[PDB]
Amino acid sequence: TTALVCDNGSGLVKAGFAGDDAPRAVFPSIVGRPRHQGVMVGMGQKDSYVGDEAQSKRGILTLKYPIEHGIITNWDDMEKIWHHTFYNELRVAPEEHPTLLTEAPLNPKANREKMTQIMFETFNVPAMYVAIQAVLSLYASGRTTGIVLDSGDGVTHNVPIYEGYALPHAIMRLDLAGRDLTDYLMKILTERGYSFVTTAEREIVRDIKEKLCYVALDFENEMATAASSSSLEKSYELPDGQVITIGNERFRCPETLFQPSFIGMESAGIHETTYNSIMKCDIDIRKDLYANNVMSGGTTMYPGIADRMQKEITALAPSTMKIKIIAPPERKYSVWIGGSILASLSTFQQMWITKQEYDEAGPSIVHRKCF
Amino acid sequence: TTALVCDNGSGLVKAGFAGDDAPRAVFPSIVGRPRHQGVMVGMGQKDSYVGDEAQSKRGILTLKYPIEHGIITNWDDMEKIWHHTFYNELRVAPEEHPTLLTEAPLNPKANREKMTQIMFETFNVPAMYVAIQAVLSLYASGRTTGIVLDSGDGVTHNVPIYEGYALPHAIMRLDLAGRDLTDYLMKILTERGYSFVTTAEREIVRDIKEKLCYVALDFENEMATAASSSSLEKSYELPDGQVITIGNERFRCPETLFQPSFIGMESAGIHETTYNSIMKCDIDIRKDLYANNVMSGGTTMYPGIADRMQKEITALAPSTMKIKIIAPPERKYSVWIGGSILASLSTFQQMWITKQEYDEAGPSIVHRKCF
Amino acid sequence: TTALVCDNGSGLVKAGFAGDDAPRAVFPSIVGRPRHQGVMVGMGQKDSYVGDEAQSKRGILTLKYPIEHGIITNWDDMEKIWHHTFYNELRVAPEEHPTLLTEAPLNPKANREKMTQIMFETFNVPAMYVAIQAVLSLYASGRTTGIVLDSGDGVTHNVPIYEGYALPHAIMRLDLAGRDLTDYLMKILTERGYSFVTTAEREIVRDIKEKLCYVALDFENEMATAASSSSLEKSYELPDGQVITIGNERFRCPETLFQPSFIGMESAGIHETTYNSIMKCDIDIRKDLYANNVMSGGTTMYPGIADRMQKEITALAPSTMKIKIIAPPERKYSVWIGGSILASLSTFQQMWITKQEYDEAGPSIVHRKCF
Numbered sequence A, B, C: 001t002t003a004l005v006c007d008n009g010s011g012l013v014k015a016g017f018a019g020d021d022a023p024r025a026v027f028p029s030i031v032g033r034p035r036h037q038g039v040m041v042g043m044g045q046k047d048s049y050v051g052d053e054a055q056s057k058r059g060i061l062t063l064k065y066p067i068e069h070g071i072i073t074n075w076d077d078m079e080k081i082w083h084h085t086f087y088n089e090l091r092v093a094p095e096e097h098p099t100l101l102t103e104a105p106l107n108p109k110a111n112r113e114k115m116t117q118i119m120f121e122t123f124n125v126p127a128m129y130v131a132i133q134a135v136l137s138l139y140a141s142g143r144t145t146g147i148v149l150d151s152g153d154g155v156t157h158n159v160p161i162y163e164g165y166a167l168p169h170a171i172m173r174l175d176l177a178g179r180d181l182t183d184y185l186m187k188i189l190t191e192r193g194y195s196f197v198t199t200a201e202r203e204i205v206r207d208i209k210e211k212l213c214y215v216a217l218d219f220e221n222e223m224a225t226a227a228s229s230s231s232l233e234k235s236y237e238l239p240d241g242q243v244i245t246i247g248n249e250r251f252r253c254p255e256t257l258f259q260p261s262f263i264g265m266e267s268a269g270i271h272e273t274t275y276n277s278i279m280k281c282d283i284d285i286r287k288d289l290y291a292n293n294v295m296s297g298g299t300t301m302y303p304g305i306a307d308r309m310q311k312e313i314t315a316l317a318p319s320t321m322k323i324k325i326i327a328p329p330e331r332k333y334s335v336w337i338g339g340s341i342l343a344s345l346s347t348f349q350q351m352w353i354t355k356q357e358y359d360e361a362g363p364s365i366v367h368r369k370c371f
């Protein structure tokens, strides 16, 4: 039976069949419920819309993300989304196909406990597993060593690995990701006048960000150049033809990745986070982590991010050494690609949590058998 | 049993059977009484006349409209109109038939309350319903989405709808319609000495308005042209042989719809009201309302009005949009046709207010079981 | 030289001198112009009227508000109102006095840019300063640690301030204020038949609101009480001579504050906004923010709103905390009184913006020498 690799990301749900090389389907993880009053008798049915249907019709809906910082907060929505992805997207019976999920490190235990409980008692999947995301990212690159910086929609996390051996005492999780960047872009935009408030309008600010934002290579220089002239301005068209124009916002918003004091946070930037992640590990493996940075996750698709991080980390690490910022072209999907790779292995097929094992031991097994 | 549709307008009662595509009865909504002595013997009885039997004898009658501005102001006579419709036009005792009525939006509660009270207590219909006029207008075109502009005889109101979900904060009503324009035409006809002072002469002026008037496409150019030439003047023959000739009145009277300050009202024209109603809707759907602007009501029957709405909304709205005014050729009965379609839904048979329910809860039930 | 303090309200301009106890002059911020034509020579002159004189004659004027939601939309008329204050109400040439102004938070930048440019180029004030309204609101009360819930005529906003160190990432600004409550009241007064359809009658609805609206401590309970008994029905006398009776509108009108979905808005009520603004702050400072909720703004004078806010917030904050609301009688002028306090301090004299500094650096200096 061909396994399934369901990466229940925090912003987008990626899914597909093991043995493939790209997800069968992608779509946002939003459950929309109508907000106004229905007058047309015999029309306006389907009290709730999920996925792309609620994405397009968002004018009359309220968009709820069930995942808030990588931690599933509302469960009824999550069950809804899993049923949707299994049936109306993949179009297969879950009770015959192994599944492989993904989770962030340092998550509350009840999260994955209930994840497995749902998978086994609602969908009756024959087998399932819960892998960490950076390990799959490091498979997707095809490596055994490296330090993985996977920044999704909810969470940012470093996870140094060396020759297959993870070093949990240096894993660092920094809860600052794409969603916060959009919520700060929305707030800065008012300086020009534009007011984006409703839940739906976050999905227009998100597109503005995805379309126009780029991380600076020298923040001070970019501010100076922007102030000098309008060379950096770019105009965007709302869904009402009205055109908006943003200048230095384009690189002020991503800057928050490196100076979380923009959003008020105390944590340090991602460059210092990765550096301090390297320093905590054993001194004799630092050489192969300094030289094997491997990015992942969507948030790392801003132009100029790689050069900026190269410069910023090299301004920290000892000069004689070499820092190499590997950025796979499809890093937006590395976790799922690695999941497919893992589910392909013959050696791995002895590590499944089978329905008999779950029935014998109970939900708590998923902690023992899973990293 | 078969239901009845009774679109009790302010100018014309349109009553018939659900299923047909036309009203079975169409008579004016007036109730006349004699203002002269009755020296004849055994002749001139029936102190009051109703409908066309009143119109044909308007020589010796005083005409009254039981409905004014869409709020019923004389129930003793609206009862006579209902009695006439049921018993002489459709020729059916209502006690057997479900009855479907209509009321304009923002129209006081104590109006439909007393309408329900009358229908249940006096005629004793098995069940009934009060559907808003814009919504039926929207069914008649079979659409799902658009901004409905009804311009009846006494009220002009908009009701934006997207995918079936109405927006109560964008329902803008403008009580300027056919009777205001009839009175204004009577006012400006005095410039040429034509003095129409009574009610019968108001009916004659209403026929003048229907027969001659048309909406200008550029008011200042039309005024200059008419003032500089006789290309526009037209004639009409009164019911005693005298012949009248009118000029720029023809397009001055309709223009009041786009400039109510012609009659002292401060509100905005119909174009501005439509734009404001759309612009109170969510940004997500304005692209779909711009291209689905419906029309209805008798007063929008002027030749070239659709072109003027096109021009005004095109000038007002953002340049990157497709304005398209939907003007069905049969749009004089659009509300009634929509009602006929609505009453013939199997899903709508659960929406009727049944006699037992009103006996239980009372007139206020209409505020619950009806829009 | 006594430095004025000109609080720029959206609905009421509050002006006076620094050091006083309360404003020397108060007058509404509207600019009116007649719509009809003059017929008698030497009468009905001076096409434009401003403020209270426009209020007095509003029967023949069209009334425009230069400010919308706190953002000066009509500069040509705000200039006239500033001229009016300086040269008729206070009756002092401004170029002899430092002039302290105010501005709401999260307010677009070009707004205060031009607000400074006009002040320095038309009136040529020797100095000036543009404070925030929450900081002044907290000055007036003499505290140092509070979260001001300032509800005005254009903007409702919270601002947590602790020991004088603001938290710029927690400030919230909602575009719901007195004017929307007035508009919703004017709409729901059509449920009874009263039609208020002119810019002149917006002020009659405004006074009906100010004089008969009150907030319910338990919305559903008050609705039941109103339906069951007429004890909540009170009558009012319109200037035209008529009389009106209003039942449950009296509290249905201010309820838009706590369930903004009544006016089609999605955002959360004021109590939820305050709770969120307190939950976005550091952990250890919430204890003192809970205990110093300082109210302000005219919209907050609705009887029963302090109690309502305290009752509602105590259901969100953990039971162990001592939620307090401070509702001084003079909370309407709080911002101006705070400005009067600020201008008199001896430590403030250095942070003025002087004519020479503006000349050397232009309007951009406002973002640098203020908050």
Ligand SMILES: Nc1ncnc2c1ncn2[C@@H]1O[C@H](COP(=O)(O)OP(=O)(O)O)[C@@H](O)[C@H]1O
Residues within 6 Å of the ligand: A008, A009, A010, A011, A012, A013, A151, A152, A153, A154, A177, A178, A179, A206, A209, A210, A297, A298, A299, A300, A301, A302, A332
């Ligand atoms: N081309 C892009 N440029 C910038 N940001 C992007 C791009 N694509 C996706 N993102 C960001 O990535 C987030 C969603 O994608 P993703 O990182 O993969 O979430 P997740 O892994 O949890 O499924 C969004 O916050 C979005 O801002």
Ligand SMILES: Nc1ncnc2c1ncn2[C@@H]1O[C@H](COP(=O)(O)OP(=O)(O)O)[C@@H](O)[C@H]1O
Residues within 6 Å of the ligand: B008, B009, B010, B011, B012, B151, B152, B153, B154, B178, B179, B206, B209, B210, B211, B297, B298, B299, B301, B302, B332
């Ligand atoms: N061809 C026409 N041209 C101009 N005005 C018209 C035309 N037909 C009807 N009207 C006007 O519309 C009014 C009646 O239209 P109607 O839709 O039936 O009003 P109601 O809301 O009561 O149903 C009349 O007063 C008449 O003046």
Ligand SMILES: Nc1ncnc2c1ncn2[C@@H]1O[C@H](COP(=O)(O)OP(=O)(O)O)[C@@H](O)[C@H]1O
Residues within 6 Å of the ligand: C008, C009, C010, C011, C012, C013, C151, C152, C153, C154, C178, C179, C206, C209, C210, C297, C298, C299, C301, C302, C332
């Ligand atoms: N006692 C009151 N009760 C209720 N509303 C009031 C009261 N006083 C003023 N208002 C309303 O608040 C607004 C004026 O108050 P204000 O705080 O000064 O607005 P702004 O800050 O913009 O100057 C007006 O819309 C008015 O209707």
Ligand SMILES: [Mg+2]
Residues within 6 Å of the ligand: A009, A010, A133, A152, A153, A297, A298, A335
């Ligand atoms: Mg991810």
Ligand SMILES: [Mg+2]
Residues within 6 Å of the ligand: B009, B133, B150, B151, B152, B153, B297, B298, B335
């Ligand atoms: Mg009509």
Ligand SMILES: [Mg+2]
Residues within 6 Å of the ligand: C009, C010, C133, C151, C152, C153, C297, C335
């Ligand atoms: Mg204020």
